[PDB]
């Protein structure tokens, strides 16, 4: 057997200033993702890029400022595709699209893998409730929908009643945090959610951060890993084609190291790469840099090394 990878485009957003994020899937593709995954020796299955259609009204307005029901229903279609990809025996890679798609991927991942854990790499905790933030900011709430302890703080919206909370507070760990709303800070502290801010990373170093993240998640038993990786986790100089750029993020090397440690476990079952928005780039070069970096995270998460040695080499040719 060789390691099998399924790839899904989920070009999901709520429009407004972040409409361009629906072009992230195609941009990551055009930076040569499937070729890189093929060179690794992965058996590949492409579901292509899913339609994102506003319900109940598919007009220009509802496509540029998207009602939340549309985001709820799109995530429900996504969950089933991820659960198909996983039931078929593929580690499932979903290309964003905004971080609201984590509602689809983690729910769908959790169906056949209920004991999964989550490594959330992001500048943001994305844990606001529909009551702590606005109606067009579902990209900043995915985790409130999935977390089990938060059920009584989370109202029932049209398009989101399908969702079964599938993560406990000890089963998610955050890496990269540097932009956290006050209620998000409250939730983290109150419900004991473990997190490594950029300050923690500066103090401990990323090597120790990954050692502690695994101690918390897989310290006692082996469990399927879901990597939810926001490109905005990287410093804005490395990944500028993103919608909420925050100065002081991961360097390229910290980000590859995360991805190498995740690979080295042998337990990566699902991966999101979100928030690549090529229209917010000032130049083609900013667009391509952000898209090349996303490809590097996915490749590295599935066994690309920096020192070579992934593919087996037998002997050297002799002169003649």
């Amino acid at each position: 057997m060789v390691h099998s990878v399924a790839v899904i485009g989920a070009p999901f957003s709520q429009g407004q200033k972040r409409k361009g994020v629906e072009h992230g899937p195609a941009a990551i593709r055009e930076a040569g993702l499937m070729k890189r995954l093929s060179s690794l020796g992965c058996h590949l299955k492409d579901f292509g890029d899913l339609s994102f259609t506003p319900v109940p009204k598919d007009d220009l307005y509802n496509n540029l400022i998207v009602n939340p029901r549309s985001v709820g229903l799109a995530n429900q279609e996504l969950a089933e595709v991820v659960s198909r990809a996983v039931s078929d025996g593929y580690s499932c890679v979903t290309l964003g699209g905004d971080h609201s798609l984590a509602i689809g991927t983690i729910s769908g991942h959790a169906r056949h893998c209920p004991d999964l854990c989550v490594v959330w790499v992001d500048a943001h905790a994305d844990i606001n409730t529909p009551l702590t933030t606005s109606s067009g900011n579902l990209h900043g709430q995915p985790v409130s929908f999935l977390l089990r302890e938060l059920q009584d703080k989370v109202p029932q919206l049209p398009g989101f009643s399908w969702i079964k909370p599938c993560i406990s507070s000890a089963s998610i760990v955050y890496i990269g945090l540097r932009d956290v709303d006050p209620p998000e800070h409250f939730i983290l502290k109150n419900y004991d959610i473990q997190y490594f801010s950029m300050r923690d990373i500066d103090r401990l170093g990323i090597q120790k951060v990954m050692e502690r993240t695994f101690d918390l998640l897989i310290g006692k038993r082996q469990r399927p890993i879901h990597l939810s990786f926001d490109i905005d986790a990287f410093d804005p100089t490395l990944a500028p084609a993103t919608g909420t750029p925050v100065v002081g993020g991961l360097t390229y090397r910290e980000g590859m190291y995360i991805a190498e440690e995740i690979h080295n476990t042998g337990l990566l079952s699902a991966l999101d790469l979100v928030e690549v928005n090529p229209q917010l780039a000032t130049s083609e070069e900013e667009a391509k840099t952000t898209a090349n970096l996303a490809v590097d995270v996915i490749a590295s998460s599935f066994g690309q090394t920096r020192e070579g040695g992934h593919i087996v080499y037998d002997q050297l040719p002799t002169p003649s």
Epitope: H23, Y61, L64, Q279
Partner: antibody, heavy 113, light 111 residues
């Protein structure tokens, strides 16, 4: 550092066909939502067509649906409007515009017409 | 077009002030953000105002947008002769599923 230039307009007979262009420069139109708006001489502005998302998808006014087709060539960074079964009332100057959203919708860049 | 109502013309002297009303329904201005476009003779419309009162880069504070109920206003103070344009309001209509516009207002600075 950013502009739009239309061409292809002129004189055509009733029941005729005609294709307008709109080349962007200084930005990548591809990742942007684009629109056509028109002005019958000495009158207001009518919205005609819009093209959004990565598929992409086209939206039309009922006064043109089934006669006009909006498209784009990402290679030539150009926006098109194909106009079939044309009528005297279709007589107008035609602008291509960039359509964006924040709280609401707005057209922040217009071509020469 | 002309879902939205504007006056056909307004005038005042240089340095003086004027407002332009934009009148709609519950299904357009009532529930959607108004934008204001300036068109100088023989030129392309330019976005002045969006989301009711957000000025674009370069547009000065003497160009002011406002909105109440189902109506919107464009205030211009300090009138210069370079203000002599046709001005249009615009928004979304959730009745016809159209971007809609007013019929325009010809501004004259009295010389």
């Amino acid at each position: 550092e950013v502009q739009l230039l239309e061409s292809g307009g002129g004189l055509v007979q009733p029941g005729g066909s005609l294709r307008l262009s709109c080349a962007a420069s200084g930005f990548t139109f591809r990742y942007e939502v684009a629109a056509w708006v028109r002005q019958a001489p000495g009158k207001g502005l009518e919205w005609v067509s819009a093209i959004s998302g990565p598929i992409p998808k086209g939206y039309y006014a009922d006064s043109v649906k089934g006669r006009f087709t909006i498209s784009r060539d990402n290679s030539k960074n150009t926006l098109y409007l194909q106009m079939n079964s044309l009528r005297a009332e279709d007589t107008a100057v035609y602008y291509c515009a960039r359509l964006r959203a924040d709280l609401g919708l707005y057209m922040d860049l217009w071509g020469r017409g | 077009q002309s879902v939205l109502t504007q006056p056909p013309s307004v005038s005042a002297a240089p340095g003086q002030k004027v407002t332009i009303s934009c009148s709609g329904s519950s299904s357009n201005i009532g529930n959607h953000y108004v934008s204001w476009y300036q068109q100088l003779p023989g030129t392309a419309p330019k976005l002045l105002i969006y989301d009711n009162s957000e000025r674009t880069a370069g547009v000065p504070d003497r160009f002011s947008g406002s909105k109440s109920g189902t109506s919107a206003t464009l205030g211009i103070t300090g009138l210069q002769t370079g203000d002599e344009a046709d001005y249009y309001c615009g928004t979304w209509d959730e009745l016809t599923s159209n971007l809609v516009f007013g019929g325009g207002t010809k501004l004259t600075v009295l010389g």
